[PDB]
Symmetry: D2
Amino acid sequence: MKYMITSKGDEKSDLLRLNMIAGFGEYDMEYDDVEPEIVISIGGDGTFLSAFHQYEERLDEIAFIGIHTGGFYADWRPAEADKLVKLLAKGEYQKVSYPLLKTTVKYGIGKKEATYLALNESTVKSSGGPFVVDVVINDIHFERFRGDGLCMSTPSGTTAYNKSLGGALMHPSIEAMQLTEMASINNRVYRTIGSPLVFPKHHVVSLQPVNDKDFQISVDHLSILHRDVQEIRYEVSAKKIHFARFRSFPFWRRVHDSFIED
Amino acid sequence: MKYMITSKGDEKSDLLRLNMIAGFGEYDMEYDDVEPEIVISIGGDGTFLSAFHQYEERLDEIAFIGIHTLGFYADWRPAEADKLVKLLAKGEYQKVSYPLLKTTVKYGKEATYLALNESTVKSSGGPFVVDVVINDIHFERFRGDGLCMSTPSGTTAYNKSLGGALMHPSIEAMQLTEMASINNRVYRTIGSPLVFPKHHVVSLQPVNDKDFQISVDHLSILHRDVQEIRYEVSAKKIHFARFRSFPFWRRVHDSFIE
Amino acid sequence: MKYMITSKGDEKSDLLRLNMIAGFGEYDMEYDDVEPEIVISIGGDGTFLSAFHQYEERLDEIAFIGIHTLGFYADWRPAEADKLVKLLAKGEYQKVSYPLLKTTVKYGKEATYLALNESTVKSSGGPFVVDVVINDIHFERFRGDGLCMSTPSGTTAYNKSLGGALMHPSIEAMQLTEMASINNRVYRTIGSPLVFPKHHVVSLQPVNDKDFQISVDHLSILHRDVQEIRYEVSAKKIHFARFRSFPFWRRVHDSFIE
Amino acid sequence: MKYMITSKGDEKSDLLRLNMIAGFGEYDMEYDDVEPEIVISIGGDGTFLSAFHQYEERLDEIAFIGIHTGGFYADWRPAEADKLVKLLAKGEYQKVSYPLLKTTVKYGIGKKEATYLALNESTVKSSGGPFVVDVVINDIHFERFRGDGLCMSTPSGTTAYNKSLGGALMHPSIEAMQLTEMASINNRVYRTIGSPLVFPKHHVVSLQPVNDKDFQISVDHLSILHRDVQEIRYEVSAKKIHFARFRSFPFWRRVHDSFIED
Ligand SMILES: Nc1ncnc2c1ncn2[C@@H]1O[C@H](CN2CC#Cc3nc4c(N)ncnc4n3[C@@H]3O[C@H](CNS(=O)(=O)CCNC(=O)C2)[C@@H](O)[C@H]3O)[C@@H](O)[C@H]1O
Ligand SMILES: Nc1ncnc2c1ncn2[C@@H]1O[C@H](CN2CC#Cc3nc4c(N)ncnc4n3[C@@H]3O[C@H](CNS(=O)(=O)CCNC(=O)C2)[C@@H](O)[C@H]3O)[C@@H](O)[C@H]1O
Ligand SMILES: Nc1ncnc2c1ncn2[C@@H]1O[C@H](CN2CC#Cc3nc4c(N)ncnc4n3[C@@H]3O[C@H](CNS(=O)(=O)CCNC(=O)C2)[C@@H](O)[C@H]3O)[C@@H](O)[C@H]1O
Ligand SMILES: Nc1ncnc2c1ncn2[C@@H]1O[C@H](CN2CC#Cc3nc4c(N)ncnc4n3[C@@H]3O[C@H](CNS(=O)(=O)CCNC(=O)C2)[C@@H](O)[C@H]3O)[C@@H](O)[C@H]1O
């Protein structure tokens, strides 16, 4: 099929790329940078996200693969690159899909709505001052949050930032999204739930400003400033990321290898 | 149809049950506490958990209703009992299902327990050390006070006090949470809570002591010669008779926020 | 003696200050905002923190009073302002001291900052990595959102939201708390908060970026070319004029419990 | 001076003991099991606590030393035992003192008061049912606690159980005690502070029962059942444990070596 490869930038990753492109040529396989079907990422999880977001408009026609150079989303060590070209050329793989998080930001008098898709998470922090938003879950005013910010994570994203916030680890087969607090203030005048929340596939969380309307919104490795925000909407995306897998690397085992030693 | 009513025991709960039985007596509603299709609980969640475990062998045939006299599982206030009698006589309700936890203990038979809130494992009295196997993976050797495995609807209970997350009951999953784990240069646990899907099995296997203080909801018993505890989302569900809209996130708000 | 009054700025706070100045005008009380021995703050803790930093070069000569119009540092309600005028004119007060945090930033001079609540260190925008040296010990290489070093009286503020502990102000110590640290198979931080005594020095030294967003109480400024941040219990203290018994644990109760 | 040695029980620790006693004999030093002045512990931190509590009535006349066989309170590796006998016989050491926690339990119609001294901590848990106590700090009813129990730790005890509860690590030069919660219930009907508390040398925390009066009280490696408890009192002890130190092993470095790798 059509493929492309994104490099991290260092000398190692680049040469591995060329070498993989040289092997791919030997098998009558076409490099298509515009509309590929297999996207290969050589680098780290930062590099994998870069590739995911490079092709977020063709996620239904793409099956990602990662090669870890320096990798939660990687399944291949560099020394396995030649083997991966072969198995790939033979079509000896099975597609697997993880859930994604849709982020919608409504802002301005024009009520523009920017929609973002996130693989790890989307976070919301203020412009420097106090962060205060109302958390609306569907039709329920759940709480008025005051603190450093809010993190909304995918299942596969719970082992990243979410984890550092005290969130829980969810198996990627659970089409859910998780909301964790960042240094929430809690006394008698202000209260939050203080517990992470896990929302199912049909629920919508709507963050609404209370005073200042400027917010720093991150989507995975990105961080955008939005002014005059009226609403930040969170929901499990209908779109899913597809991985081309050739062997068994269960999620918990991947959790075990990343955080548990001996 | 056939029903029963279980009471917390106090004077108020007892009279309310008597009054409702007298109201059902005006309809084709048969009191039968051996084979009830409707079980009404009058009391707190402790009462409701008791009623659930009193009929765990026929959950597939029963619809539970809770009347609160904190009532997380109760949908009804005591003043509206008479209204509940009529609405139930008229069959003006839908059936909602909540997922449950299957807890299996095998020795050296095999005792199986269903849970609505959670199941925790602590030590008889000494050091608590157990290996945590997930499916075919030896995930970690836990060293602490104990472990908690809760249902979605139990995440707002003991799981919440442990730092776990609250999961909407539409998710068929179970969450595992540590109790004061040890993390030094050697001993290492994940720390984070864990949320497993319906097709996963969490197996706790002893390392040193084989006696464990095992809990299922409000019940706690010393189990001896334990060779394994296995947790997994039960194929069985608990069914409530729902009369008006009362979403889960709303109950969570009312119980903790304001 | 010489005094001054600083106001939050709103209409009520401004008039109250005017009314008190008119009351002090009946006693040998000289208004002097260059060299005041008594500084009165009318507003919130944000006002009080501002007043403190407006006179940090003469803390050894000033006694602070706080009038609340959440007021953790305020001892006085607005209705009792007139009573405060008389009691202060009569010298009917004792002096209580709270410990402070010394924050030193050295580049490639050396800026020094006193703190009443805390000092936090975050990243300009990229990854935050800093080595944490305690005295002559390389304790850990922190990887996270940032770090918070608070005074005893600041432990009820930002330090509390981070999970730190509340320390009674009679303890001359400072507490360090992490902000969303990273703990995987490689990166490893202590996790627990740290409480250091008066004779210890906590030095944060960059690894990669040398630009840090540094905060002292309510002030936050981008510091560039930072070579080190050093934290240590300041030899200096903040002095309040205390008129009635109001213990620290009582203020904590009123602010968080009921 | 007069010394004694407590062994863990295994074959290694016992032989090291005898061998140290053989060396101590060579230096005209007297083993006194009743009223020693140096107490040496060979084993782990569990063994060290056993020795501390074996001699809690002569803490003003004793200087403890630990040898780690399998040790937060140890300063010596077994291969250093001969060296320790020599330096000890030469009096080449400096005494250092850590704070301790006094625990007083008032119980029964007779209002008996049992007083315990703890090196790590003292914890309070119920008889199996619900645990509900009022926390009185001096003359202030601070909170009514509902949960699994309460932990009160010494400075040197903050790196043990306290740590596992989310408490903070205090340098042993701070004569304070720290209170951490065990799975406190928090909703709208019940509230706790949720934060660890650090009390100074002059403050007294008084746990008072609300309903049931039976409690399981632990003091370091011990756990006693007290019936009809009226009050559990906590305060920094006037007594301090003395260590004979011969070299620099700073507390934070000891924290570093125990929990921080590489
Ligand atoms: N305080 C925080 N704690 C934990 N995670 C955080 C924090 N702040 C941000 N993040 C995550 O960073 C992602 C952005 N990042 C790419 C990645 C990634 C990634 N994803 C996963 C995953 N799914 N599971 C498990 N580990 C994963 N990691 C690993 O994380 C490290 C990168 N983070 S950093 O080097 O500390 C600074 C931020 N780095 C970037 O700019 C690029 C690497 O070792 C990587 O391998 C965001 O999306 C947040 O999630
Ligand atoms: N440290 C703990 N923290 C939090 N929960 C704990 C703790 N220890 C045990 N549990 C739970 O108790 C259940 C058993 N319990 C009946 C119930 C219930 C119940 N279930 C839910 C739910 N699903 N969501 C939201 N609130 C819920 N609650 C409420 O919880 C309180 C009961 N806890 S108690 O009175 O403080 C002492 C223990 N109580 C019993 O003997 C009887 C009541 O207000 C009740 O209304 C076990 O199953 C554990 O889970
Ligand atoms: N995520 C955070 N959570 C908790 N505290 C935080 C957080 N971020 C910053 N801070 C502290 O704010 C101080 C600066 N702040 C003035 C004050 C104060 C103050 N000091 C104490 C004290 N010692 N004990 C007990 N309560 C105290 N409070 C109360 O705190 C609230 C202010 N926080 S805010 O309005 O939500 C947003 C930030 N506010 C400002 O701009 C001005 C008020 O009700 C106040 O009354 C810094 O110094 C950080 O410490
Ligand atoms: N959930 C818990 N998490 C953390 N600590 C706990 C927990 N439960 C009890 N404790 C402590 O145990 C002491 C009793 N214990 C002797 C010791 C000790 C000791 N003291 C210190 C110290 N000051 N700093 C740093 N590490 C220290 N350790 C180390 O701790 C382990 C022992 N705990 S155990 O093997 O998990 C089960 C309980 N063991 C006993 O019966 C005997 C060893 O590796 C030891 O080296 C109590 O006093 C609690 O503090």
